[PDB]
Design a protein around this ligand. Structure first.
Ligand SMILES: Nc1cc(C(F)(F)F)ncn1
Length: 229
């Protein structure tokens, strides 16, 4: 009997509870349940991934086609907060991947620094994502940008970071809380407006979904970056 199965997304697993392979066996990050499966001399531990805390987990359970975050990927994570979702991104990309965790809160930044002490593949970047010139010398070209900055101007922020750091043909995954962009607009109006702006920066959406029942009026947009020569 096989208890934990590879999910369709590489690096993600099931048992429906979503889990990731714990990069730091023995440690929880935010109180999450851990499941360790021993067989002979083999041993593997997984970490439960809460979709009521993590928009990426909510999107995966909601049936997103691609997340692009995968083993070996280099990920620029804008709005890393205290590292809840970042820790699972770190699990997914694994030892040969990289996660830049950009977060401008010094309080949350201390959580990220503690998280990255154990996880060699996390680089904490305690900076304002509006001013990538301040940290551009730290960030190697990445495969994916994940953005959860929850600002009216977050599309322009993500675009600015994409133009600096994202490889041609790399991908983006953007979390959009509608009332953080414009609380006097309908969710549909916000999402249409942000998708339109993305297209104008050669950030081409390939799918979009909302996150019910985990969140209200919250979208994830996944797409591909195809900038001009
Ligand atoms: N949580 C955040 C937000 C930002 C922002 F707003 F400046 F883009 N930069 C970094 N972390």
């Amino acid at each position: 009997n096989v208890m934990v199965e590879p999910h369709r997304h590489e690096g993600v697993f099931i048992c429906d509870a979503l889990v990731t392979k714990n990069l730091v066996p023995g440690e929880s990050v935010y109180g999450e349940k851990r499941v360790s499966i021993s067989e002979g001399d083999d041993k593997i531990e997984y970490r439960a991934w809460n979709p009521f805390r993590s928009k990426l987990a909510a999107a995966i359970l909601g049936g997103v086609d691609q997340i692009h975050i995968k083993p070996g990927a280099k990920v620029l994570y804008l709005g890393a907060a205290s590292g809840t979702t970042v820790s699972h991104v770190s699990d997914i990309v694994g030892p040969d991947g990289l996660v830049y965790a950009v977060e401008f809160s010094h309080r949350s930044g201390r959580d990220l620094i503690n998280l990255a002490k154990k996880r060699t593949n996390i680089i904490p970047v305690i900076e304002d994502a509006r001013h990538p010139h301040k940290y551009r010398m730290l960030i190697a070209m990445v495969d994916v940008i994940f953005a959860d900055v929850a600002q009216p101007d977050q599309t322009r922020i993500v675009a600015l970071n994409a133009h600096t750091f994202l490889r041609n043909g790399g991908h983006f995954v953007i979390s959009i809380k509608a009332n953080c962009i414009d609380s006097t607009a309908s969710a549909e109006a916000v999402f249409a407006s942000e998708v339109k702006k993305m297209q104008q920066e050669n950030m081409k959406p390939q799918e979009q979904l909302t996150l019910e029942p985990y969140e209200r009026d919250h979208a994830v947009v996944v797409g591909v970056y195809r900038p001009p020569p």
